[PDB]
Automatic annotation (TrEMBL), chain C:
This is Uncharacterized protein. It comes from Haemophilus parainfluenzae. It comes from the Bacteria. CDD domains: AcrIIC4 (cd22802).
Length: 81, 88, 87, 88
């Protein structure tokens, strides 16, 4: 399953999150950390100390990190089923 | 509304969390913190039944006490958001 | 023998704490009576500070609430002593 | 004045409760009532330890949580009295 900024909110779901410890706990933390970073990225547009250009640049770059993380977490869960 | 263990999960959803994002800062941030803390405490409480170092009675006791605390926090989050006009 | 003069000497936190060793059927009733007597005594003079009560009525209420609190404390102490509490 | 569990018994005194009598009428009994309620809640907070029907662990949790609430009550009472000019 590919992961983009646009499908992130429909793959990084509560249903998918609930779906072995040495794979459980890292992948969980990864999935979650992607959730917290994605949400803080969206809040850059609320920061009135950021220019429009800086907030867009930071948003895209942080969102990518949460996307690449979720891509990695899904890929690892899929190698383990 | 009255939060209970039975209706917690129908209310502590990602979509109702996102409803919070329209609020101002001194409201949005504490309400979101309480909401998120409740959700995460409720979820760790589910994990107790998978802890094989817990007896059946200790896991059930722990799960009830943690869910009760999580329910408290969600009730406060909902009450504070509704005072600000949020409709869940 | 409880009187209005010795009430404050006897109705102490220390004496109230002794009641915690009472068995349950006696404990909450005697604790409740002791505490109620203390609240009633302590608040007896409050009508003096209420501008809507004459001072003469305030003094009457003071003495009558005090008298009732003294009887209440006497009952609580007597019942506790019957269960072996030493004051 | 900042109330804590460690200084509660030092501030919640009969001499400080006595200062409340010079309070104006609409503030006096409300603030005295909060003050007395805090003192009662603090003072009885350890009652569950003497109660054979409560686990010692539950009694300790109830002790701390009753104390924390009593501290907040007293703090409110002191703050409201100070706003009316009471010097403790």
């Amino acid at each position: 399953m590919k992961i983009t900024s646009s499908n992130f909110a429909t793959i990084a779901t509560s249903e998918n999150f609930a779906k072995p410890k040495n794979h459980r706990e890292p992948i969980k933390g990864l999935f979650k950390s992607a959730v917290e970073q994605f949400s803080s990225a969206r809040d850059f547009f609320k920061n009135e100390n950021y220019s429009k250009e800086l907030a867009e640049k930071f948003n895209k770059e942080a969102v990518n990190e949460a996307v690449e993380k979720l891509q990695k977490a899904i890929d690892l869960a899929e190698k383990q089923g």
